[PDB]
Write a protein that binds this DNA or RNA. Structure first.
Ligand SMILES: [Zn+2]
Lengths: 121, 125, 208, 75, 84, 49
RNA sequence: AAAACUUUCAGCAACGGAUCUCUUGGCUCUCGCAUCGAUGAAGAACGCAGCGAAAUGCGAUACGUAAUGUGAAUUGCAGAAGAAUCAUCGAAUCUUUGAACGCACAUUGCGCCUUUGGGACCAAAGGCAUGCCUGUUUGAGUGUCAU
RNA sequence: GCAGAUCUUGGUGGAAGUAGCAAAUAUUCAAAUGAGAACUUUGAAGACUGAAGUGGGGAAAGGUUCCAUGUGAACAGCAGUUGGACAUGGGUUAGUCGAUCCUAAGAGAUAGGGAAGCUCCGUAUGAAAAUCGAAAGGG
RNA sequence: GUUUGGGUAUAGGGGCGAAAGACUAAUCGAACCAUCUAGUAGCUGGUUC
RNA sequence: UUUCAAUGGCCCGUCUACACGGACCAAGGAGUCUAGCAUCUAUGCGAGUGUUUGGGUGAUGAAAACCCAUCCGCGAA
RNA sequence: AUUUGACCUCAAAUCAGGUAGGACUACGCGCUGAACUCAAUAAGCGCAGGAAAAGAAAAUAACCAUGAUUCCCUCAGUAACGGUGAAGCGGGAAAAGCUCAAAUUUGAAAUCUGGCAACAUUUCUUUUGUUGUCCGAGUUGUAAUUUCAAGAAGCUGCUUUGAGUGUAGACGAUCGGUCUAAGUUCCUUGGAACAGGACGUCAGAGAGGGUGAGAACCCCGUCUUUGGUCGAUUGGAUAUGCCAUAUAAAGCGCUUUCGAAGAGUCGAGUUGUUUGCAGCUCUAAAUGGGUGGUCAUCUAAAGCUAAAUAUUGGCGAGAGACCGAUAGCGAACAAGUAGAGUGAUCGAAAGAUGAAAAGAACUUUGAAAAGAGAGUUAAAUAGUACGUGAAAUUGCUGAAAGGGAAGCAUUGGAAAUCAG
């Protein structure tokens, strides 16, 4: 099968053409199965299916990194590019606004913080 | 006796883990000891069993038979050895299976990965 | 305890009187093997057992502290008598002295070889072999229930300070090591039988 | 004389419990937004509760949680 | 409804570990704060002395330590109690 | 009848595939208790409902 | 008054599945942890393997792909031969539905907006639910006013 | 620790090769297949349903029972070479036939009004404007 | 010598009924289903060497 | 052990003779756990008695065991 | 006339950006609520979390006074009510306090969301921010100071100070990677040694599991491990570097000062629910109001907050004086499956060949199915209808008895058999 890394160092159109010829080959392999083929062809059906899956994977990755580059350093980005941990974590308070304190509390923690002490036994 | 709490001692859990271990774990479970010359040559007591290894049977009805391994038939914790077969009713050859722990490895199949294993497991090449 | 819902999560009501059959409730429905069969009864198949076992049975029992201390003191006194040890079953025919006292030099042991050498040299190793030879396969459902093997009991080594004695002795079959300040009755007189063979150290004996 | 239907296959729960005239499923309560459930039907709850299906997302979340919900690509 | 106590050794072990974790976290300082000597408020127990919640403002001022820094150095303060 | 909807036909289609005999090779596998079919239905017998 | 028949006893053979032994199951107790969903949840449907009906897994990239670790398999046959029904898992895909969201759904029914492609028509991609909040734009008011 | 509880579950008996077998007049001869023919196939003969059919079609309902090939383990209160059973395959082709479109009885979203609330009234209603419902109706 | 197919409406001490104290999925001492419920027992039948 | 001869022998359980159950066999199957109170017995201590609400130690499995402490319970009117 | 611009109110948008639904429910908070004290239970409805709720006194007390909440022992089965049934105190587990409204910054809205542009930072190209500019919000009040424990305004002279940004080592922890001591030596039995006997070894490892029977030394593991070795994260401190801007802020002792404090709310009458709450008539005060018997104690009608506590659900584990296939979950198995009902729902049965299919080649009879010879195996008294294989019941063989019962007991003969 095609190696994923050398699939990555190619351009969009070549992967598109490789995708197209793979589909021709898969269609040819399946009609051999219907009309009667050898075990090599029946086993080749699976490996060519996986190789199209590899090409779809690398194409989608290249598109998504391209989109992330386009939306890099922006306030709003597509919901697919946004993180998805849980709905609760997304709705929760961020650490910055959990650490926000009034100036009254800032003065209190400036002047009377939790001191470092000890007792002699 | 075990003193930790991360490990189990229940017969139920040990058998479930043993007979449900995936192929990667059955590789370690299907280990065999080395011969005296091999042990003194690599400073290794036991090694995992791999195909195309030259082994000799130590226990069973084939005690003393010697040959290479044709396959480590993992999903039954079983080995298959060249010429260690059985005559069926018709006369065909049915391979006689031997447990991995009942044989001794008299000659290894050296590649870079196995040499890495030897030097990693407190051994010398 | 059994499940509190065991035998109840079916659906079965009594068919009534005059049915030419017993009045125990029977599962409703039809077309299935269970329909028409009885339920809700200790006699009935797949029914709740009589008085289902409960978790708040009295499992633990309170013993007066003075009674516990009385038993432990008597257990130590029993261990200091040769005849009770022979009845206990300890092979102490050639033990030089009972009670057996050993110097503090054994509280800093490091190897099972050293511990076994001491046991042979005091001639207490007959008891260890008796324990080792007595290892058997348990009779009954115990081995199904995580009680696979059964053996005897060997010498009880009582120490004062753990500097390596516990680890150097813990692997000899039958040898049980305990601190002098936490003498357990279950180890001093196991099985309710008095007079275990106990090996003391000097510091533990002085602290007794 | 028995050649009519009272219930049909439900869209939401795939059972033949969706009434025709009432147009409400007797099993799951569709088209109600809330799934029909009743505490007296403990067995009825456990026949249709979570875990009787694929749980495809929940297994994804659990494996993700076990590692602190990290994202990106390792070295 | 029954409340069984089969987790009593488990609770005891967990509390001890929590004390151990607390000690490890704030090791420089004692794990228990200073507590005032206080007399129970009844005719049956007015002959004893036990540990009160915290000191009062008058006691803090008489000692010379301010109510602000008293919390910082580990002296609990009770604003309800008064010295009669 | 001869006026079934698509959903009815599709449900019928898989119900016809479910009651088919089991291939022998899956039986011949090891550790495979499957040796017959316990979901075999017949049209004259129990209805699909 | 012999056979046959009936009954009793014993051996053997049947019928049946008790007993004994086991057990990747159940039950109970204890300890640890806090993690669903409009970025589409739980659930349902329909499909996916060379030879599969169920179970499991997965979603037209379909008994899966990417990445990391292991290091030479899978196996019932055939088959070729960084393999594998391996583990981990942070990158992706995820069909029809479902709170289900263009209108409906006992219907593979009926639409509208934007763009593109094909040799008016068709196809493809992206969109069109409700309530509420902050802001933006346009307004409506013989509501109050200033020129 | 069981002899009972019209006990539970499972297994097995005597009655007993006993009661009995289905309505719907009725079958016979020859040949072929076949291990095996009262029951399969062809011919000949005799009958029956007698257009209000034992005829040819459809709706509801069933769902592959349809057709070919093969089998005779199990089912067809006899039998079977046959079957609607089993096994392997094949088979439903629409601009004009229907659904889809419209609406009837009826159901019901929305704007508003109630209810502690899931939600009920309201649908032409005091709003800054529907939909579903007929494989026998209309087309 | 009115009947009836389909669609729809009416649901439980309710509906429906030219009224039989009738029908309401082979059930109407009072529809069916699941919980409370392991309901209530002066009573019956069994209760093991 | 089978069998014969003589003698004897009504079918068991339940319920107040009758009646009710019983075709046969195997397995299951019915005074249990718990809270309080009372008598008696035994054990420990004794004008005292009760560790396990709690704390400490316990490494070898640590839900056990061992140790420690003020209330408080009953009793001492 | 009427045109222009404001403010107020209300609309519309497939406007820009967000949010709510549904599911689980063991534990948690409310509403509602029966029947046979039942029971503030079950059912029904709403809503959360890892805990929830409660919580810093409009609290107890009558003391030498205690001092937020929660939980446990005790109070105590006491007070109280007519069987129900507390609380104060006392001993413990855990501890942590606070934030607003009510007063002018008036020499300066000093405050904040959003748009635009850069700078950054990340569990992360996925996160979170900084600055500048514009518009908007906002004087019908956003900032700073104040919360009654006080506090403000003067006066005083002592003390204190960052909501920062890199580098290194140590100290922990999470994830997975990887490391581990010794017989397979001899003889007998056996299909197989993992059994018995002999000779030995390791043990900080003699727990457990697998392997052709009871394996510490064949293998996995186990002890070492509260650790060595890899990597990736971080949490907090130490050393070290760089920015900050204090012309300030804060604590403490005095007052020659004032001290703002929550309304259809408290409260009363009436009806309803188990003092507490709600409906309704009516409706307050400012040394006032609430609570307890003039006194004592609190300061409501506004808000936040870890910990000890619960946890038949979910996810991981460790166990057991539990059950051992009519038992234990309904389900050890293709189980909420087959199947039943229009539906709500109801819901089983069924584990074991052998070490290894080695699953009986081949021949013969038979239409076939099968049988008989063989063959595999230690075993076919293991042939899948497969471990062991009981009873009821049935067939055959052998022995015996029998004229409308049979069973049983006592004595002895006859036959069979065993024994001293
Ligand atoms: Zn439904």
């Amino acid at each position: 099968a095609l190696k994923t890394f050398e699939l990555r160092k190619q351009s969009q159109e070549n992967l598109a053409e490789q995708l197209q010829e793979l589909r021709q080959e898969l269609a040819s392999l399946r009609v051999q199965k219907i009309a009667g083929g050898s075990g090599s062809k029946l086993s080749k059906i699976k490996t060519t299916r996986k190789d199209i899956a590899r090409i779809l994977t690398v194409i989608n990755e290249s598109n998504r990194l391209a989109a992330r580059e386009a939306y890099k350093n922006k306030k709003y980005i597509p919901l697919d590019l946004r993180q998805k941990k849980t709905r609760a974590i997304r709705r929760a308070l961020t650490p910055y606004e959990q650490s926000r304190k009034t100036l009254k509390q800032i003065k209190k923690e400036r002047y009377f913080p939790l001191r470092k002490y000890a007792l002699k036994a | 006796m075990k003193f930790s709490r991360d490990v189990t001692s229940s017969r139920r859990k040990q058998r479930k883990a043993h007979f449900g271990a995936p192929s990667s774990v059955r590789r370690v479970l299907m280990s065999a000891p080395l011969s005296k010359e091999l042990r003194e040559q690599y400073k290794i007591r036991s090694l995992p069993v791999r195909r195309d290894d030259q082994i000799t049977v130590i226990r069973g009805s084939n005690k003393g038979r010697e040959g290479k391994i044709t396959s480590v038939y993992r999903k039954k914790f079983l080995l298959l050895i060249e010429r260690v077969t059985r005559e069926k009713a018709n006369g065909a050859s049915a391979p006689v299976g031997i447990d991995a722990s009942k044989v001794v490895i008299t000659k290894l199949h050296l590649d870079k990965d196995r040499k890495d294993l030897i030097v990693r497991k407190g051994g010398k090449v | 305890a059994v499940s509190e819902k065991a035998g109840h999560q079916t659906s079965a009501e009594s068919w009534g009187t005059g049915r030419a059959l017993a009045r125990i409730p029977r599962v409703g429905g039809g077309g299935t093997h269970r329909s028409g069969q009885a339920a809700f009864g200790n006699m009935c198949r797949s029914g709740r057992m009589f008085a289902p076992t409960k978790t708040w049975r009295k499992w633990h029992v309170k013993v007066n502290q003075n009674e516990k201390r009385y038993a432990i003191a008597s257990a130590v006194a029993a261990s200091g008598v040769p005849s009770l040890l022979l009845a206990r079953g300890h092979r102490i025919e050639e033990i030089p002295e009972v009670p057996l006292v050993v110097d503090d030099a054994v509280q800093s042991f490091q190897k099972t070889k050293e511990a076994v050498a001491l046991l042979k040299e005091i001639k207490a190793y007959r008891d260890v072999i008796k324990v080792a030879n007595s290892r058997k396969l348990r009779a009954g459902k115990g081995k199904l229930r995580n009680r696979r093997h059964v053996q005897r009991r060997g010498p009880l080594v009582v120490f004062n300070e753990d500097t390596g004695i516990v680890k150097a002795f813990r692997n000899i079959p039958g040898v049980e090591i305990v601190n002098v300040r936490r003498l357990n009755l279950l180890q001093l007189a196991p099985g309710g039988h008095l007079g275990r063979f106990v090996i003391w150290t000097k510091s533990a004996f002085g602290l007794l | 004389m028995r050649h009519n239907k009272s219930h049909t296959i439900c869209r939401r729960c795939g059972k033949r419990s969706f009434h025709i005239q009432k147009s409400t499923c007797a099993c799951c309560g569709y088209p109600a937004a809330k799934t029909r459930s009743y505490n007296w039907g403990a067995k009825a709850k456990r026949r249709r509760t979570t875990g009787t299906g694929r749980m495809s997302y929940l297994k994804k979340v659990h494996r993700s949680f076990k590692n602190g919900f990290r994202s990106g690509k390792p070295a | 409804y029954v409340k069984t106590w089969f987790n009593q050794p488990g609770r005891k072990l967990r509390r001890r570990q929590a004390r151990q974790t607390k000690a490890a976290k704030i090791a420089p300082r004692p794990v228990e704060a200073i507590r005032p000597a206080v007399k129970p408020p009844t005719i049956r127990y007015n002959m004893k002395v036990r540990a009160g919640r915290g000191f009062t403002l008058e006691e803090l001022k008489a000692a010379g330590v301010s109510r602000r820094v008293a919390s910082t150095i580990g002296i609990p303060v009770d604003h309800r109690r008064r010295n009669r | 009848p001869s006026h079934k909807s698509f959903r009815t036909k599709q449900k019928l289609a898989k119900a016809a595939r479910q009651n088919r005999p089991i291939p022998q090779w899956i039986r011949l596998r090891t550790g495979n208790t499957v040796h017959y079919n316990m979901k075999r239905r017949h049209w004259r017998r129990t209805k699909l409902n």
